[PDB]
Design an enzyme around this catalytic site. Structure first.
Site: not given
Ligand SMILES: CS(=O)(=O)N1CCC[C@H](NC(=O)[C@H](CCC2CCCCC2)NC(=O)c2ccc(CNC(=O)c3cnc4ccccn34)cc2)C1
Length: 332
Positions: A29, A159
């Site tokens: 992750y 995501d």
């Molecule tokens: C290239 S990029 O950087 O632009 N990028 C590329 C594709 C994915 C990115 N998406 C995003 O921006 C969304 C935001 C967009 C949004 C849109 C619709 C509504 C939902 C999402 N960021 C995240 O979802 C996110 C999630 C978790 C974490 C940290 N916590 C963990 O990982 C965690 C927590 N518990 C555990 C247990 C085990 C392992 C890990 N964990 C950080 C960020 C974009």
């Protein structure tokens, strides 16, 4: 300004405030540690963004992710507990850190779900999608591995940056003009199908297979859809793939609640202009037990105008610094 400390994990230098203790790496992750938040006696997740400002596209993908996170204030959507740099000034700013709740499991690793377990879980995604979609935000990558579950079967949409194709709407894979929010709804139909049946609905080996499996069930495009497609050569290709022996909805979801199949036939529609919205789907009879329309909130105005911009490394960096700094942690 808090007191930061330094330790090396999985050949990565972590620097975090003294409130986050007992950092252990979790995973695949990216650069993610579980941490004990000493403030709130709750386990949290710290994510150190990998070279956030390496290029122009990392610096913008970094700004976007933080803007998106800072926006999400919903029960069924991942929230931002904390963001931080160890950096003193803008000058010495290279590393961004995100803190989220720890997700014990996802829709996969919590999965013979009862009809009521399916109702509750799909209600919460559509409740999370109404909110997200109201801010003109599209997930574009909804799959079970992007849906956190807890002890008490409550669900957050998030995501990670990890098969997508299985939950991916046909218009994206066929490269049609009109994208809209309802690309996510197709995915929810693909995810819900899987919860009802216990098997992945469209288990495609490649995108062409994927489309052959979709068309076999949802039929070949009817006239009303064909009218909206410009190129002869696209209009032929969608028919070249709809040659596989027709399959009907009543036999694929036999056993399932008739109101779940009724909902799935409105989700798994080829015409994305005719596909049910998150908002309409919450009001479907299948959710009678859970649908409270006074408790299905829309999102605040979201400034999305940066998506259109072509800026330098230093502007994206600067903008991101100004977001980290203006972040007010949420109240417990
Ligand atoms: C290239 S990029 O950087 O632009 N990028 C590329 C594709 C994915 C990115 N998406 C995003 O921006 C969304 C935001 C967009 C949004 C849109 C619709 C509504 C939902 C999402 N960021 C995240 O979802 C996110 C999630 C978790 C974490 C940290 N916590 C963990 O990982 C965690 C927590 N518990 C555990 C247990 C085990 C392992 C890990 N964990 C950080 C960020 C974009």
């Amino acid at each position: 300004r808090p007191t930061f400390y330094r330790q090396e994990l999985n050949k990565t230098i972590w620097e975090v405030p003294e409130r986050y203790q007992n950092l252990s790496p979790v995973g695949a992750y990216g650069s993610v540690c579980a941490a004990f938040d000493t403030k709130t006696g709750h386990r949290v997740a710290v994510k150190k963004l990998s070279r956030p400002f390496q290029s122009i596209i990392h610096a913008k993908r970094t700004y976007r992710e933080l803007r998106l996170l800072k926006h999400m204030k919903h029960e069924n959507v991942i929230g931002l507990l904390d963001v931080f740099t160890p950096a003193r000034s803008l000058e010495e700013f290279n590393d961004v850190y995100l803190v989220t709740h720890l997700m014990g499991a996802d829709l996969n690793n919590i999965v013979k779900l009862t009809d009521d377990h399916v109702q509750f879980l799909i209600y919460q995604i559509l409740r999370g999608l109404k909110y997200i979609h109201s801010a003109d935000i599209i997930h574009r990558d909804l799959k079970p591995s992007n849906l956190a579950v807890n002890e008490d079967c409550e669900l957050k949409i998030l995501d990670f940056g990890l098969a997508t194709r299985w939950y991916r709407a046909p218009e994206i894979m066929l490269n049609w003009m009109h994208y809209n929010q309802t690309v996510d709804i197709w995915s929810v139909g693909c995810i819900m199908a899987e919860l009802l049946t216990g098997r992945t609905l469209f288990p495609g080996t490649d995108h062409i297979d994927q489309l052959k499996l979709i068309l076999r069930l949802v039929g070949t495009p009817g006239a009303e859809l064909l009218k909206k497609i410009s190129s002869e050569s696209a209009r032929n290709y969608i028919q070249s793939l709809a040659q596989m022996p027709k399959m009907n909805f009543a036999n694929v979801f036999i056993g399932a609640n008739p109101l779940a199949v009724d909902l799935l036939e409105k989700m798994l529609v080829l015409d994305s202009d005719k596909r049910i919205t998150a908002a309409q789907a919450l009001a479907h009879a299948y959710f009678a037990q859970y649908h409270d329309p006074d408790d299905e909130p829309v999102a605040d105005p979201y400034d999305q105008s940066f998506e259109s911009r072509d800026l330098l490394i230093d502007e994206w960096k600067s903008l991101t610094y100004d977001e980290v700094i203006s972040f007010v942690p949420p109240p417990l």
